[PDB]
Design a protein around this ligand. Structure first.
Ligand SMILES: [Cu+2]
Ligand SMILES: [Cu+2]
Ligand SMILES: [Cu+2]
Ligand SMILES: [Cu+2]
Ligand SMILES: [Cu+2]
Ligand SMILES: [Cu+2]
Ligand code: NA
Ligand code: NA
Length: 583
């Protein structure tokens, strides 16, 4: 009665509310186009089956694996071949082939309506049926983010509830909601980006990469913990993210809860910053641990030169246990460098490995590997200069212009990429500056590079969907640690052919005057990308000037009596003269 029914076990432990939540998320992520009602009935059916099994675990089919049961359920969906031309071919297969097929078919750019707040109608729908309202939130977010961290989404759904709980009762109801919903959306976009990076590391580089990344990060966050505790947490967390990215949202949640329990049981040994996190409820606790502030450096951190540089038997220790020795190094170097980005630590660790590989084949390895730490100095200075440079730009020109700079920089790197994707990436990269440049200067490098990694991964995911550029492919697939430097190193692609001019691309009309500011920016930034594509060798200062002229023209005509006549008269001349400005 314990080995028998996995679905009963999961139902019992997780409980009905979370069980149904996670199954809704999983179904919304696998079948992103189906209507809400379809998914709700699937969820209810599955829950019913779980409760029957919980009664009699020896009943028929209660023995079957979670994947088999979820996959079967997905395969009983109305109009599958019509809605999803491919996922039905997946339904011909058994597990685990079927699940791999499903995962293959997930869509990272489903191209759905933007989630626009409607305070009146939303509060109404929230009041008449809260469960249906929060379920809809889960569904809408889950399908817009098919790799979103399942329990994390349940946590955000609870924050969404709290927003509507405090705001709907009175007043504008929109001046209460809109800023809170805007903050929630930014947290959603961030959270998705982090989880997608973890899943992408699994997909593209494997579990050893995910472990290394986790070792680095957790060592930084918990420098007091010893290598055994870090290793344990990393093994557990890796398994957690493996199951979540693999689709096992139930295993995902259950192992995530166990890990939080363990961490809070050993918080004294792990970190002083976990106190607050451990006093909170389940979901909130996991959240808090995931985002916990880094603990203060221990006063008894060991000197590393003696064991990792000066020791004469390093080649023996390395040849004996490559993985273990390298892991120890990474733990030790990371815990004492919260001022480094995770990817920087991974590069340093690769350099350490490469130095040992080289030195241990030569006559006198000792004298060779004695200056290993000194090989880290260039790797450190490069990103520090970049961050310093870009923050100097950000603080001079502000987000918009900084974004414009990045949109130019990346369009020259990859002019074959679609204007929407370039705009999206450029704007995300620009937001990095707003997030990181204001922080204490010690935190600017880690903040900047870690968020850059998220944005570049987003670009790499879109590029997997729609491959256009071999340079992007190489940078996206060669080395996870080297991705940001690889991208930074790209110059203008001179094999590119300037896109043939099309006046309507740069032609504006009065409609733009009604848009909110950000959608107006996006229109202008799209034009900018198109300018670069047409004139790849134009300097960023030329493009900045031309875009200024375009911006001024838009502002004038939007303020005009006959806005449309203003556009009709002015636009064509600006369009013609721009070409000449961009030679
Ligand atoms: Cu049993
Ligand atoms: Cu149990
Ligand atoms: Cu599995
Ligand atoms: Cu969170
Ligand atoms: Cu030794
Ligand atoms: Cu017009
Ligand atoms: Na790997
Ligand atoms: Na276009």
């Amino acid at each position: 009665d314990t080995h028998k029914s996995e679905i009963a076990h999961r139902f019992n432990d997780l409980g009905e509310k979370h069980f149904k939540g996670l199954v809704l998320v999983a179904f919304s992520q696998y079948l992103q186009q189906c209507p809400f009602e379809d998914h709700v009935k699937l969820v209810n059916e599955v829950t019913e089956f779980a409760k029957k099994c919980a009664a009699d675990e020896s009943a028929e089919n209660c023995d079957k694996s979670l994947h088999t049961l979820f996959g079967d359920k997905l395969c009983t969906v109305a109009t599958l071949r019509a809605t999803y031309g491919e996922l039905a071919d997946c339904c011909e297969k058994q597990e685990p082939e079927r699940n791999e097929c499903f995962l293959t078919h997930k869509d990272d750019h489903p191209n759905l309506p933007k989630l626009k707040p409607e305070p009146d109608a939303q509060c109404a729908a929230f009041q008449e049926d809260p469960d249906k309202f929060l379920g809809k939130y889960l569904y809408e977010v889950a399908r817009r983010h098919p790799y979103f961290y399942g329990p994390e989404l349940l946590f955000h759904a609870e924050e969404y509830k709290a927003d509507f709980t405090e705001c709907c009762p009175a007043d504008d109801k929109l001046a209460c909601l809109i800023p809170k919903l805007d903050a929630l959306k930014e947290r959603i976009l961030l959270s998705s980006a982090k989880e997608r990076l973890k899943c992408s590391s699994f997909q593209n580089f494997g579990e050893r990469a995910v472990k290394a990344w986790s070792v680095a990060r957790l060592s930084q966050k918990f420098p007091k913990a010893d290598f055994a505790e870090v290793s344990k947490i990393v093994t557990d967390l890796t398994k957690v993210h493996k199951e979540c990215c693999h689709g096992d949202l139930l295993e995902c949640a259950d192992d995530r809860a166990d890990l939080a329990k363990y961490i809070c049981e050993h918080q004294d040994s792990i970190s002083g910053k976990l106190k607050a996190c451990c006093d909170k409820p389940l979901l909130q606790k996991s959240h808090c641990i995931a985002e916990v502030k880094e603990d203060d450096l221990p006063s008894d951190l060991p000197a590393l030169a003696a064991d990792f540089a000066e020791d004469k038997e390093i080649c023996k220790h390395y040849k004996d246990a490559k993985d273990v020795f390298l892991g120890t190094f990474l733990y030790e170097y990371s815990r004492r460098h919260p001022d480094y980005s995770v990817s920087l630590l991974l590069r340093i660790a690769k350099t350490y490995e490469a130095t040992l590989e080289k030195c241990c084949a030569e006559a006198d390895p000792p004298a060779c590997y004695r200056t290993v730490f000194d090989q880290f100095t260039p790797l450190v200075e490069e990103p520090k200069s970049l961050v310093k440079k870009n923050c100097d730009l950000f603080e001079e020109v502000g987000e918009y212009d900084f974004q414009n700079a990045l949109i130019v920089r990346y369009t020259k790197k990859a002019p074959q990429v679609s204007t929407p994707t370039l705009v999206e990436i450029g704007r995300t990269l620009g937001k990095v500056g707003s997030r990181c440049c204001k922080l204490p200067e010690s935190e600017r490098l880690p903040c900047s590079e870690n968020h850059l990694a998220l944005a570049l991964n987003r670009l790499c995911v879109l590029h997997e969907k729609t491959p256009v550029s071999e340079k992007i492919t190489k940078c996206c697939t060669d080395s996870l640690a080297e991705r940001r430097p690889c991208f930074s190193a790209l110059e203008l692609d001179e094999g590119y052919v300037p896109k043939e001019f099309k006046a309507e691309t740069f032609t504006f009309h009065a409609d733009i005057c009604t848009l909110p500011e950000d959608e107006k920016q996006i229109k202008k930034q799209s034009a900018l990308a198109e300018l670069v594509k047409h004139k790849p060798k134009a300097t960023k200062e030329q493009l900045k000037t031309v875009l200024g002229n375009f911006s001024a023209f838009v502002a004038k005509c939007c303020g005009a009596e006959d806005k449309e006549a203003c556009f009709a008269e002015e636009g064509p001349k600006l369009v013609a003269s721009s070409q000449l400005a961009l030679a």
